[PDB]
Design an enzyme around this catalytic site. Sequence first.
Site, PDB file in Angstrom:
ATOM      1  N   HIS A 151       0.821  -1.207   0.000  1.00 21.02           N
ATOM      2  CA  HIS A 151       0.000   0.000   0.000  1.00 21.02           C
ATOM      3  C   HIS A 151       0.857   1.260   0.000  1.00 21.02           C
ATOM      4  O   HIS A 151       0.467   2.283  -0.575  1.00 21.02           O
ATOM      5  CB  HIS A 151      -0.948  -0.010   1.200  1.00 21.02           C
ATOM      6  CG  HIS A 151      -0.261   0.180   2.516  1.00 21.02           C
ATOM      7  ND1 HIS A 151       0.366  -0.849   3.184  1.00 21.02           N
ATOM      8  CD2 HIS A 151      -0.095   1.284   3.283  1.00 21.02           C
ATOM      9  CE1 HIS A 151       0.883  -0.389   4.310  1.00 21.02           C
ATOM     10  NE2 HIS A 151       0.617   0.902   4.394  1.00 21.02           N
TER      11      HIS A 151
ATOM     12  N   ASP B 202      -0.794  -7.814   1.146  1.00 14.17           N
ATOM     13  CA  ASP B 202      -0.427  -6.400   1.081  1.00 14.17           C
ATOM     14  C   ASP B 202       1.085  -6.222   1.191  1.00 14.17           C
ATOM     15  O   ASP B 202       1.578  -5.307   1.853  1.00 14.17           O
ATOM     16  CB  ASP B 202      -1.150  -5.609   2.178  1.00 14.17           C
ATOM     17  CG  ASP B 202      -1.350  -4.141   1.825  1.00 14.17           C
ATOM     18  OD1 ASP B 202      -1.164  -3.756   0.652  1.00 14.17           O
ATOM     19  OD2 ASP B 202      -1.700  -3.362   2.736  1.00 14.17           O
TER      20      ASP B 202
ATOM     21  N   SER C 285       4.515   2.236   8.390  1.00  6.08           N
ATOM     22  CA  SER C 285       4.249   0.908   7.861  1.00  6.08           C
ATOM     23  C   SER C 285       5.546   0.242   7.415  1.00  6.08           C
ATOM     24  O   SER C 285       6.467   0.893   6.916  1.00  6.08           O
ATOM     25  CB  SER C 285       3.271   0.985   6.688  1.00  6.08           C
ATOM     26  OG  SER C 285       1.951   1.217   7.144  1.00  6.08           O
TER      27      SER C 285
END
EC number: 3.4.21.90
Lengths: 153, 153, 48
Positions: free
Chosen positions: B30, B52, B104
Amino acid sequence: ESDKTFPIMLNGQVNGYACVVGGRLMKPLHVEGKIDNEQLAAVKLKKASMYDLEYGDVPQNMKSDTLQYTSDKPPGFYNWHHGAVQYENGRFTVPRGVGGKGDSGRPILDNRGRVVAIVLGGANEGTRTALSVVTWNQKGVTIKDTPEGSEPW
Amino acid sequence: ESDKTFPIMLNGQVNGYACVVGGRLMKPLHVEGKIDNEQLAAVKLKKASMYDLEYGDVPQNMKSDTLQYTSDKPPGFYNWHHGAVQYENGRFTVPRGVGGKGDSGRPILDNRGRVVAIVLGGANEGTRTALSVVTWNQKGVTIKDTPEGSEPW
Amino acid sequence: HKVDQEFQAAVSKTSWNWLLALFGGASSLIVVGLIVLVCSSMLINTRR
């Protein structure tokens, strides 16, 4: 290591080392040369080409004084002619710049003076050098650990 | 963590982190950006879209110097770039307020220096913040643990 | 010609068998692919 490890010569240059383990002599196939000891020159060396090795039966006199193999491999550090070799994740490495051509067949020694592997080649990887070798197993199974880019020393 | 964790650039801003574990480099899908390392820019990434994530084979001169993986996860406090993270009831949580967008892909380390999980997002419950991460299992299964209301950072 | 020539009963059973084999191969293959995808998803969910 000094007593029971014989270099193989060729035109006066050492190009490997042969090892008597478990009452049987072993020598690697990629190296070509003449075994130093005269008594072991008469052993007919049965070849395992896919194992890159030849093995032979040592005579009666010298089968008592041989290096001992081992199956249990507690991860950590192991003895070797050029210092300590490092074992983790089912893999052997050494500090970079240690070892080179002509070191094939040199056994890896442990704390109690027993063999755990036989060096065949190495790949230089900057941070360390990964050793392509042959190792034992719990069920009496001999397995190669040859990482990518391995070069037969 | 500082040495082996790299920043990802999005128009010149930090927006994530790419982690090298066990000779493979992972990066959240992402988060969009360019890896700062020039060598890693040439590494082909194969993508697990449902997880992801994208993973690739790292080059030959960094795979050993990598964040060693582990699977044993007793509950308690674990290391983190921003401090300590609490693993309780099979859930990773942090104090509410710390962490956010751009974090992240941050690796979560162990006391001995091993990686336990990689952060992907977080959801605020008001008292604490539960982190949607990927956690490993004894049988070698990577479950993407995402608490309800998780938002990828 | 005392009888009209239709489409259904106008091709030999050898041709019918070959055509049906060639088409049923693709049909069974797509069915097996769907089954494989469903089984893989269910295995992922169970062992997740």
